[PDB]
Design a protein around this ligand. Structure first.
Ligand SMILES: COc1ccc(C2(CNC(=O)c3ccc(NC(=O)c4cnc(C)o4)cc3Cl)CCOCC2)cc1
Ligand SMILES: [Zn+2]
Lengths: 162, 46
């Protein structure tokens, strides 16, 4: 069902997505242990993800939430990093596969800081780093994140001790 | 898990590090659409 459409670097859509990536990098309290040491990325490719079935079920759910929340879906664009990106884009997100308890329980996690999502691309705490070099700060291997449309609805506010 | 009753998601908002932005959690897959796939390298600082 899924096709991937390459965006050209001159496309305004490429540029606005890249700008969100680059500008939401921060320093992390682990000094780069999980995700590596960097202030910015080299963006190699941006692809639009097109899947009619996944989109229709997104918009169907969005309408339900919105009607539960004074006609406010509370839709954001957020980063997601994990090792399951290739399954997600073909099969969609699936809460049944998301059974790992984290800081906020089991569930599907997103971040405003792209650098936060970057810490998880090779796994929890960055796992053992890239498959080729076992380096969590590898400057050579190619990484992937998703920039996702997410319906929050009424969101429970959890202040965290981080 | 499940959203807390009467809510559709959780917002995890850092309260110590004032420069860290939020994380969010959802509990249904249909509440997100993976719209862009970004392929990149991290860059070594100069
Ligand atoms: C092994 O690497 C990781 C990395 C990050 C995570 C955490 C984030 N994980 C998720 O957001 C998450 C999202 C989607 C999925 N999977 C899918 O939606 C999915 C759909 N179809 C498949 C095959 O998977 C799984 C997880 Cl564990 C879980 C809590 O701990 C911190 C973040 C869990 C495991
Ligand atoms: Zn590597």
């Amino acid at each position: 069902g899924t096709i991937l459409i390459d965006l050209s670097p001159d496309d305004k859509e490429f540029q606005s997505v890249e700008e969100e990536m680059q500008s939401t990098v921060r320093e992390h309290r682990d000094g780069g242990h999980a995700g590596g040491i960097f202030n910015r990325y080299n963006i190699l490719k941006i692809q639009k993800v097109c899947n009619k079935k996944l989109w229709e079920r997104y918009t169907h759910r969005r309408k339900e939430v919105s009607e539960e929340n004074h006609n406010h879906a509370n839709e954001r664009m957020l980063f997601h990093g994990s090792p399951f990106v290739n399954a997600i884009i073909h099969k969609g997100f699936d809460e049944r596969h998301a059974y790992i308890g984290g800081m906020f329980g089991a569930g599907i996690y997103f971040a405003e800081n792209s650098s936060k999502s970057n810490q998880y691309v090779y796994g929890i705490g960055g796992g053992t780093g890239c498959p080729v070099h076992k380096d969590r700060s590898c400057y050579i291997c190619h990484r992937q994140l998703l920039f996702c449309r997410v319906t929050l609805g009424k969101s429970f506010l959890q202040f965290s001790a981080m | 898990a499940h959203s807390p009753p009467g809510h559709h998601s959780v917002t995890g908002r850092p309260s110590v590090n004032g420069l860290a932005l939020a994380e969010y959690v959802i509990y249904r897959g249909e509440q997100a659409y993976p719209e862009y796939l970004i392929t990149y390298q991290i860059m070594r600082p100069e």
